[PDB]
Task: structure prediction
Amino acid sequence: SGFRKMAFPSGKVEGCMVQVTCGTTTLNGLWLDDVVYCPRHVICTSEDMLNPNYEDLLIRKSNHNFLVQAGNVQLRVIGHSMQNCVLKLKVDTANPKTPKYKFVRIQPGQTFSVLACYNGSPSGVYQCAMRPNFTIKGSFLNGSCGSVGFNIDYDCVSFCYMHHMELPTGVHAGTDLEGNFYGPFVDRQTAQAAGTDTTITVNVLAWLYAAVINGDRWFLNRFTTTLNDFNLVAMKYNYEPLTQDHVDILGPLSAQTGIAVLDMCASLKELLQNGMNGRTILGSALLEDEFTPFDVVRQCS
Amino acid sequence: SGFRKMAFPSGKVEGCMVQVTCGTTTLNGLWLDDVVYCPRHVICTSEDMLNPNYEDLLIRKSNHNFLVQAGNVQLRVIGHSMQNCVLKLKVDTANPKTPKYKFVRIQPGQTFSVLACYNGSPSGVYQCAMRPNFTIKGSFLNGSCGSVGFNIDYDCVSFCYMHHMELPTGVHAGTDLEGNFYGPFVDRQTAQAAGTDTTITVNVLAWLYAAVINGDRWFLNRFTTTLNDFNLVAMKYNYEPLTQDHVDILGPLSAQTGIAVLDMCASLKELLQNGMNGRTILGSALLEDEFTPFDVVRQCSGVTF
Ligand SMILES: CN(C)CC(=O)NC[C@@]1(C(=O)Nc2cncc3ccccc23)CCOc2ccc(Cl)cc21
Ligand SMILES: CN(C)CC(=O)NC[C@@]1(C(=O)Nc2cncc3ccccc23)CCOc2ccc(Cl)cc21
Result:
């Protein structure tokens, strides 16, 4: 019993964190096999932040301009290349702690663990989700760039995020491990803003199923709803549309609790209309949307 | 920016998790140097748990009855002893991944990271607080026993908790690494209940300071209060008493934000008597009490391990 926001154990990623220094800039790198991945903005100066020409800046760099430190050991850079917004520094040593890994690009609503790092040293691990507006609500200070987001499948680390920047509202933007930004963001200091964020409806429903599995039933009602009527209501509360894919995804939790998805949707509509009235669900006074249907099943069963 | 419930990096503890099997029971063990620590209830059967005489049950066990597995490698048990509610299995191999460590007993209100394990394999890490009623609001399924709670100070792991059981309300009970239970709990299948819990006041204040550091100031007011008047109001809402020690520990956050501790106490008093009024603090509609003043400073300044 109990339901917590739970991150994956970070050990497999900790053994991959290194410090990358280029001139006066120091950030984090991910050392896998003989390659160190890091945000390409590490090559930028104060004059190259508004409109950097990364191809032009990178061509002017030599391998010895990149200082890579793994623990108290300096790694030797023997090559450098850019893949989208990620810099790939070929090093002369394969990381002996390289876990079984994959690079995966995730979709909004997906969750992942973040290992926040400074100077190539892990500071903390937390859980978050890719917001529908493609930002993440992280906890990151200056120097956290290059910190990664991941999930673990048995003994395989799926890297899904690398931190690049903080937007004016305090939310965070980054890329997958192929350097493709999530969202319409660019690695420039040009005015950028996160779009209006919405609540991840399928995740709220999964969390209501987690509450039922944990014995919390006060919010259930005798009603059901059509999928279209639910979306019409949910949209008015800035909730993401619930698709038939989402309804299908919730099938196993629906079977386990005996509450049809559209029956749970009617409970969610009622919660949106009434609020909680001094009550809580799984220790929260707000509807939680950073647990996926997969997270709920994993944590409960 | 941002404020998250953040656990310590779990790597140093992951390299210590092993699976301990005794008869039909399988749970987790903590392998440090040449000793595997685990809950002594691993030696119990269904009948035993009802009224166990652990000295009597343990004397009947031989070293070969305990199957210890570290990864896909079986460790050899060469001795066994009991220290309070923890079983200590001496093994022939010292854990090469043993970090710098200490065993520490924490106080209620102190937070720690839990590495939840099943079959000696880490499944997740979460941060929690030792409740004033000595339970933890954890997330554990059957097989999680032996999972540990820890903090990190520089490169030293301080082990503070080992999971033993789940109470009828779904909250959790366990011991320090010396086998002493936190709270009035015993390791037996008998009627036990968590006492009425209270809110960790010093932690709520620390979290209000974290909200201010992050730009959330709506709850601040022009008022201050005496420590005694605040404690009188705190008693009413089932909040823990705020001591002068707590006021002192909040000193650095008070200096950083420019809000005296008793000034923040007057904000907390108003939040208690009047509520949030539809507003949230750090994305929460409830006052969060599972961040200590040290956690807030560590997160808002970026301390690394
Ligand atoms: C040193 N400087 C030349 C480069 C640099 O490190 N820039 C990093 C920077 C950025 O967003 N950094 C940060 C990241 N996460 C959390 C933060 C919390 C507080 C302050 C900064 C934070 C700052 C300037 O705005 C941009 C704009 C585009 C991009 Cl991709 C990055 C950035
Ligand atoms: C029965 N026994 C030989 C094996 C066993 O399962 N013992 C463990 C047990 C216990 O509390 N287990 C659990 C721990 N954490 C989370 C759980 C979630 C769901 C179900 C069980 C959970 C079972 C119940 O009763 C007691 C009572 C005293 C103590 Cl110290 C332990 C136990």
